[PDB]
Amino acid sequence: QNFHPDSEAAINRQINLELYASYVYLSMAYYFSRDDVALNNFSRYFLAQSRAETAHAEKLMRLQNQRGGRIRLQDIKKPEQDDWESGLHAMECALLLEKNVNQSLLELHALASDKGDPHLCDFLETYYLNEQVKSIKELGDHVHNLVKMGAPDAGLAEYLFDTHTLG
Amino acid sequence: QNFHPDSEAAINRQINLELYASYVYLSMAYYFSRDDVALNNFSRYFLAQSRAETAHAEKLMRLQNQRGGRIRLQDIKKPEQDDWESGLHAMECALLLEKNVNQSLLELHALASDKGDPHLCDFLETYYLNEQVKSIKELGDHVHNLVKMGAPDAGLAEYLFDTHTLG
């Protein structure tokens, strides 16, 4: 009922994007536990983000079931890098990822609005759009502090941020 | 130390296979919560399996870090089906998946043995090989009961199994 085929397909694309985001954060988490990086609170922070993205994907999969759509899964692409370079660079990449996921969600909302699907609009507003705003804000805060502190080249910056903000 | 490049690569392949298994089980979980399947304990059972496979993948990623190897992630391929057909068919597919993952782990163990890597052999024996045996046994039990009960065509079989064994 009131579930447009374009919306079903767009939900499936968003599911894949959320799973991709989860994979990016998983990669980041295990980069920070390398013996040549060893920033354990950066690691835990990104692991927590990874698990949150899996929950984001699952809520959309539940939505598809609830609305009578058909979940169509696609390959989860590997992240763009295996070496994330530094705490600052990972934070900057996460910030860009969240902005890109946000743009996809806003396009999905525009599609739902065009199709007159208020249930889908409310779902996105309730569980996704403000979560994205908060995440983009948090990551921007972290990027700003790391830059001001002199990361990645100032030897104390990422260590101090790991042990005081993320710990 | 004592970490052969062939082993590093084989660990990365096993990481990908564990993530694939997690994805298969996630797909199965959300198949069973469709409005035309609606077997909620099959759904929860496979969701729990999915989360266990993610843990399997993470332990190998930790092993790579601990040994000084480099994690190299690859695309997580989508599962072979989106429509898993029945509770019995999903159980049979899970059984085959676990046997295939087991064969990969036994090949990894043979490689570790050939390279004289007792730490890697013990890691596989401690966390993987018996887990696989138990999982293959459990799934075989479930397949047998579903077949004997008359699944998928006997209308009460999958429902009764959902509500008594998996619930």
Place this chain on the structure above:
Amino acid sequence: QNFHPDSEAAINRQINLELYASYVYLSMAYYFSRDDVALNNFSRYFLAQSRAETAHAEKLMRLQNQRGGRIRLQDIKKPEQDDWESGLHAMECALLLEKNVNQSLLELHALASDKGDPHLCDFLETYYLNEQVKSIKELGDHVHNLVKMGAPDAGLAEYLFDTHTLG
């Protein structure tokens, strides 16, 4: 005192028979946990019976010591089958076993009576004869329900009995 050599020997034969019964039930327990049988409550039920028969044997061994007799152990023969065929067939075999053990106990009681051994008669009446009656009754109940339900050929019967009576 008042302990006839025929009674000493008959007690030793009964010890062996109780140990045999324990072995039969152990075999049954592990038949029901095969991956092609997988009736876990049948398995637990027969395992509990096995442990009870070991206790039956030990009480007779204690009796021999208390009365000044000499325990003389013999081989414990393997059970008649390794494949118990079905839940119904195992229950029917257990019923026959308990009737046979009961007949042996009643012959032992008749011998004790003939030898004027009231301590031995009371021992059998107190710990064995009513236990056997209760066990034969319980197994007869189980056989009747399984037969009426359509076991072994009705696919739901043994499963439902496992999950509702024995569970």
Place this chain on the structure above:
Amino acid sequence: QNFHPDSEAAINRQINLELYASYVYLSMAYYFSRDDVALNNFSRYFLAQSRAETAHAEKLMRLQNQRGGRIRLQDIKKPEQDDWESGLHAMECALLLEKNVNQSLLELHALASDKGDPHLCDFLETYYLNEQVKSIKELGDHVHNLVKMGAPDAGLAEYLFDTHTLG
């Protein structure tokens, strides 16, 4: 999977040997509660060993089921003696029994290694090989103390050992 027929048969032989060990210890337990031996802590010690051997047998029976093998039970032979002669002699016989069971387990491990069965090797290493080493050590300790104390001919030795080490 990866379960060699020679291994299936060797597991069945080991099951029988563990059940035999349990029977030997049961015989010993009830020897020590004779009115002409009356060493109640020797009795309890060997009864506890008997129950441990039954658990050893059951774990192998479970392994057979888990791996898809077929349990094939054989007669449990009676112990070599019904009169165990003394506390020292029983301890010496138990020590020899455990060494013989250990040799059988090491042959089983060598077979599993030859067949490339790391799951079976790990199973034996995890639950059997160190248990055997500890048991052989404990029994050797007990034999040494009993010999030094003058057992069986020094009238106080077995009594004092019963009441201070085993009690």
Place this chain on the structure above:
Amino acid sequence: QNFHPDSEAAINRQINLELYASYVYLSMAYYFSRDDVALNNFSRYFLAQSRAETAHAEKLMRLQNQRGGRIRLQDIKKPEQDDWESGLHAMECALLLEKNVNQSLLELHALASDKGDPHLCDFLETYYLNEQVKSIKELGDHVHNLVKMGAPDAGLAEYLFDTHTLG
């Protein structure tokens, strides 16, 4: 009802025998607290036996009342010795006493059986015959340990038995 005069008289004889046994054990208890014996746990052990025999006598007196018989008390004869010689000798005398009391109870049971008095037979089987078997076994155990330890001439034997088995 169904209470034969021969049984009434035999119950009265058994009452007297139980009271005699209580007196023997009282004498033994106070022998072991002499300043030239001073085995306080032998003393407590026999005092406990004395009190148990008084209970045995009282239960028969209650039986007489319950059945409508007439209690006819007789002198309680003094024990055969006032000097019980040693811990071993007292244990051996207690063993003989319990065997003699057992023979009297078995004769009483035979009389009750001949008179068709199942209530009296059951009373003896329930409260007397197995108690006697257990007591004869316990005393035989104690005699055996004391003999093997070298009592009464080995200076440490009775002391060690007092402080470890009876204490």
Place this chain on the structure above:
Amino acid sequence: QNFHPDSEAAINRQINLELYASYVYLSMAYYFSRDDVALNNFSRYFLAQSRAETAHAEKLMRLQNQRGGRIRLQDIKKPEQDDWESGLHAMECALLLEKNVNQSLLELHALASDKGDPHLCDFLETYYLNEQVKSIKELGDHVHNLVKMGAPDAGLAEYLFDTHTLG
């Protein structure tokens, strides 16, 4: 049983090496509590490592006893330095020590494998090989952070590491 003389000797050499490692860490602990070093959490960290190495030595001494080998102790050589120079240098020396101890353990495992001693192989895999991997990883993490922070010449680096990672 199955305990090769070469293995007995190699175990004794490993005992000595573990005791040496304990001594190195004890020296390091008391270097960091000098009035001209005064890094109390470096001190506590290395003291904890010292106590862990003593436990490593004791477990091998117990193994020798359990297997019937003869412990043969040798002088514990003093550490290579009394002045450990800096927090970074001590961490780098500890890392090299643990790699050297690891290589000795892997040689011991290879010897045990060659001699067909699965109990010894499992002992090393269970209690030593993964402990070494974890320790080498931890020390590598610490070295990396100290280097990146600018230790030993950056005046705040070792102090901050002491007070945030090791405290």
Place this chain on the structure above:
Amino acid sequence: QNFHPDSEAAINRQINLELYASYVYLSMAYYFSRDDVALNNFSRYFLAQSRAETAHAEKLMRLQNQRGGRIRLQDIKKPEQDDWESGLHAMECALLLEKNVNQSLLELHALASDKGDPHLCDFLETYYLNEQVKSIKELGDHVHNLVKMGAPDAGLAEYLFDTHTLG
């Protein structure tokens, strides 16, 4: 301040002697857990002594740091024997060791007195001299009881001492 170079060197010699004493007691502890000695409370007693000597060494190392001295470690020599012969012989060797350590401490006190170092004198009096007196007294008590009991040749003596004084 007021810390003479002769005192610094003598403290370093005493550190080494305390570590040697700890090693002697460690050797003794593991002698008593051999399968041909098996005196578990002798073993625990000497293990506790070993740990106490390590604490004695550490307190002197702390003293060196507190006073601004330089700890200079030396090899810890192996104990004089690996086979300690008997419980009595080990106790006699421990008694001689403690007397020798006491003489070294009294020489250290005489040196501190000659150098006008009341802090060092008080340190020795507070933590070492009375501890040594108590230890020499305790070991003398143990030697006396073992000798009087007939150790090592009286088969019950060391066993009884293990189970009553040290247990």
